Amino acid sequence: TMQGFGVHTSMWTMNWDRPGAERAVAAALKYEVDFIEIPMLNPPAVDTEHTRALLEKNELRALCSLGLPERAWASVRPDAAIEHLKVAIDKTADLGGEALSGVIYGGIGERTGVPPTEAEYDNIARVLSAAAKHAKSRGIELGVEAVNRYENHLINTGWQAVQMIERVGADNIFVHLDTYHMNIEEKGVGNGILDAREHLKYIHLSESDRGTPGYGTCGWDEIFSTLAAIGFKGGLAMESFINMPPEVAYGLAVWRPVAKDEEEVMGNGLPFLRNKAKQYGLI
Amino acid sequence: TMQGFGVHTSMWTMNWDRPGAERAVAAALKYEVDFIEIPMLNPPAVDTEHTRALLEKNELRALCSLGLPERAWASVRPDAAIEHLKVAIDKTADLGGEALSGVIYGGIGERTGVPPTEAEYDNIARVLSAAAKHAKSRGIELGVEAVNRYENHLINTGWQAVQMIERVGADNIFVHLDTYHMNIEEKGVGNGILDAREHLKYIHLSESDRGTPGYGTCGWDEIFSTLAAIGFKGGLAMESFINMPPEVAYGLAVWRPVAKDEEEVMGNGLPFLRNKAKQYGLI
Amino acid sequence: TMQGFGVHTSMWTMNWDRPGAERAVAAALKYEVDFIEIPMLNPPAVDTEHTRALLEKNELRALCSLGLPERAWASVRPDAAIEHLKVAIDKTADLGGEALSGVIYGGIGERTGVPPTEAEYDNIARVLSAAAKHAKSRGIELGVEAVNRYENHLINTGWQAVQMIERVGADNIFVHLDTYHMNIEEKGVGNGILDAREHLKYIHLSESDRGTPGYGTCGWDEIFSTLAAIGFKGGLAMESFINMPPEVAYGLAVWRPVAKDEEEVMGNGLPFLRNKAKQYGLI
Amino acid sequence: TMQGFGVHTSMWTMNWDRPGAERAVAAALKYEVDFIEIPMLNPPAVDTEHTRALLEKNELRALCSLGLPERAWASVRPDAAIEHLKVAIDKTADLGGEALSGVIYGGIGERTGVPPTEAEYDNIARVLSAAAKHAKSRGIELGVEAVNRYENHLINTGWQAVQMIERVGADNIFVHLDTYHMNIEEKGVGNGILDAREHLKYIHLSESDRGTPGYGTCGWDEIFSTLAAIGFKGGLAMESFINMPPEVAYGLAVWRPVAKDEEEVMGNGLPFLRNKAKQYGLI
Numbered sequence A, B, C, D: 001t002m003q004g005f006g007v008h009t010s011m012w013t014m015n016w017d018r019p020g021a022e023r024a025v026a027a028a029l030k031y032e033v034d035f036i037e038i039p040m041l042n043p044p045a046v047d048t049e050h051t052r053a054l055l056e057k058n059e060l061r062a063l064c065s066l067g068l069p070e071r072a073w074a075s076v077r078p079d080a081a082i083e084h085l086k087v088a089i090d091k092t093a094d095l096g097g098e099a100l101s102g103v104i105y106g107g108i109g110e111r112t113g114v115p116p117t118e119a120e121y122d123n124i125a126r127v128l129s130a131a132a133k134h135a136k137s138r139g140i141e142l143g144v145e146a147v148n149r150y151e152n153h154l155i156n157t158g159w160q161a162v163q164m165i166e167r168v169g170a171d172n173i174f175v176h177l178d179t180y181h182m183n184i185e186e187k188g189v190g191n192g193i194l195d196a197r198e199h200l201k202y203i204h205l206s207e208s209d210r211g212t213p214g215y216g217t218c219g220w221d222e223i224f225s226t227l228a229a230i231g232f233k234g235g236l237a238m239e240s241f242i243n244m245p246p247e248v249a250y251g252l253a254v255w256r257p258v259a260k261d262e263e264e265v266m267g268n269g270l271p272f273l274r275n276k277a278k279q280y281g282l283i
């Protein structure tokens, strides 16, 4: 269960190869965060012992996220999804990760053009029940990230994520919210946190255009006040798509730069988020 | 403990005489609220039995509020303050009221020009302990309303109000917040609710200029999200100074109309507030 | 140039057929709006005389909007695009419409998977000049609506829209903003309006989740203040997808109801927006 | 008229005596601001030659503000008001200041207990006309600052400020707004800027609780969007009562620290404000 402030490492590498891991860890120490979120584009390619040693040497904690590739979208190909998640779960555990979170129930770009069906949710629930048991056997948790309607048609709101978690009824699955998605989906941004309050262990603090937090349209005071009010003691992870490699940015509809450079995003956005966290007593 | 929506009868009556009481109860039923807040400007003159019958006949609940007159400000004249609050407490209880709230620790217009001192707080503590015991004997609670720096120099934030309630140590004093005062005093409006969460039983939903809720500078979404997040189950009371008699309006620095008339304030503000209450699941 | 308050007819109908036209117009009368916005998604299916007659009979102005079907995306099939727009232009004029607006430059759901090319914008420019010439021949104007990154990759912000319009050189193309889209795309929502200032004649007052204005995450005070500040005088139109036009469903990604029903949205959203327009003095 | 960013010197000193002036000007230099606002509350006590040399040495511009002492309130004692303003104006000019601004029309803490009257405003107009003449003779301008109802009963909104400027008919009096006061007085904070637009040349970017800008309740996005929309090119000045000049302490009502210290307000507030100025393109 994460604690404090962290950063999504896409700001310094989307590929967790050896130089990428080193560059992300160095950045994390520079900005003095408590944890990093490691994206696993290609789980088999990850050097678990290098990463584990980096994290322990520099007293850094970690979790991992992914989205399922189309060959393994849980809604329609659940056995492939179980297989893909078991690999990702095992890499996460081996490198010292405490959790695998993100769109672990489908992939960026699912859309049937109609509302989500019961059969789609049944497959997801089966995929998630299997994956959670494999996660508990390796001592880690699983996260369900609500994402906006355009990225996935199945889980877009805090309350939909909670409804999936109750179906499965596994102890070790938590909700993962993202203010960039909440800014589109939640009927008042605080409502996402409210609906998910019993299961919220992680939140992406991302600006409305994936740019510099504080300089967009997210209602930060509402967000931080509501987190304080529910007693949120999970992970506060900054996410910006700045200096994300172009072929992974184009995939999530980044057609133009989200901010000038890392030095605007991290120099303005991290102090802003940490000050707000202090202001509302989360620290 | 109060529950649901209510209205400060300021809008129809600042003198709770017999026809004022009738008019205010009539308005309450027209807007179909759950309770009214009766300002007790002159407690001795209140006809308790008349009001009690009005409330019971019409299945309305009620509480009362005041501020201490200068001859009885608790910080400097605790014995007079005690005498004044006993009369108010007894009139509140006799008319069927469930609490006496407001600036019961001081007066509107108190200012020494320097920070509140420990001797002032000792006097207030002694007054409040005596007042709360007298209220327990009559079966009612007392509320300590945080008001802004210009109205009183002693209790301006939820955290100061909580500190006083812990000093006194009495079970039947709760915190009373006001969004108009909070908009000035709280370092992030939701922090006043957070700080007072253990003790908060009543809140005035008043716009930043005492006009029409929804049409000023208050952070309504943060306020309602935070109230829902702490699980607030007490009273939601609209306060606007529209149609307040002139001499009372001047006492509170109303130098110009806050709003066009009651049509705007209750016709626009009450639906806005009840819609927000519904939006964030307080209903 | 449209003036006052209007509604996009998805409030009341999926399709602009004869029974849909009859019901939408009757509903617009009931709420005393000044204009309706008619989706022009199947031009050869619209009974223009039946619509024109209803407009005159009921003292109702109108304009039309569309997105281009993939067979005529200007980005890539410019010649098809020009010819589709000439037809839509002609039918807009025939029924009494005063402009054709929206995503007239491409698809709702158009995505190459990479950033837009100057060749794509070269084709759009050609399409738009040709179209604006034909619109001039029928006495109507064209509007270019900026939409978010997931619905189109070419024109996402007021500033992009303005650059396109300045390239084309037509006197009769205006910018059309939508608060739902700016909520995602603009770095501070008022920046969309500021950048579009010289050309902004139409805006969709659409909530962040396409639901009821005032009950999402859009920054309405900033929006209305900035519109007042720039002297906005064009049209103010609600857009809530209670009913979803079939040809654009896939791209609009409404997978679940945006609000309880049509009466919630007009009953709560329209007073809220009229009240904000009066609050900020909008012409 | 001023340009760029400045600070009210109460950030760094209580009194504009000689060691205060040295401390304030040295602090200003570390933050690289363009100007400082010097209180002019005991005009005979200001060493103008020492201040001027400090300002020119360190390439800092300056203006002054004050509130009138009760012996010289223009409402009631216009002849004394004129004589006090003539001396304040001369000292402002002698030290290199470019305007005298603030509550030049009355007192910080002035209240009759009743609403303002024509006789009061007629006296203010007579005083300001004489003052503006004397200001023109020394080559500086005068500002009228709207302050909230508790600090003064005469000029509380931008529209009231403008009305006084037009009642006086001078050509060298501007309007001075303050977000801390607008947060209470304006019916939507942008409305204060809108109403004052033709005359607005100076604004106090002060947080709702006089603390750190960005960490209170002011609607900064609406403020900066609206300032950009009207083409604001005047001074942008912080005002945080880290130190309280004793002559106005009673009226300003700072009873508890507004923030931890000058390092917090300037280290977090100034970058927030600069970044917002950049975001909305005032630069």
Ligand SMILES: O=C(CO)[C@H](O)[C@H](O)[C@H](O)CO
Pocket: C008, C038, C039, C040, C065, C066, C067, C101, C102, C103, C108, C145, C147, C151, C178, C204, C239, C252
């Ligand atoms: O906001 C919109 C959806 O992106 C646009 O208004 C559409 O262009 C419109 O519905 C077409 O009728």
Ligand SMILES: O=C(CO)[C@H](O)[C@H](O)[C@H](O)CO
Pocket: D038, D039, D040, D065, D066, D067, D101, D102, D103, D108, D145, D147, D151, D178, D204, D239, D252
């Ligand atoms: O905001 C203010 C009053 O509350 C003004 O800035 C004062 O005029 C200033 O503090 C006087 O130096």
Ligand SMILES: [Mg+2]
Pocket: A145, A177, A178, A204, A239
């Ligand atoms: Mg995320």
Ligand SMILES: [Mg+2]
Pocket: B145, B177, B178, B204, B239
């Ligand atoms: Mg109150």
Ligand SMILES: [Mg+2]
Pocket: C145, C177, C178, C204, C206, C239
């Ligand atoms: Mg639209």
Ligand SMILES: [Mg+2]
Pocket: D145, D177, D178, D204, D206, D239
């Ligand atoms: Mg000021």
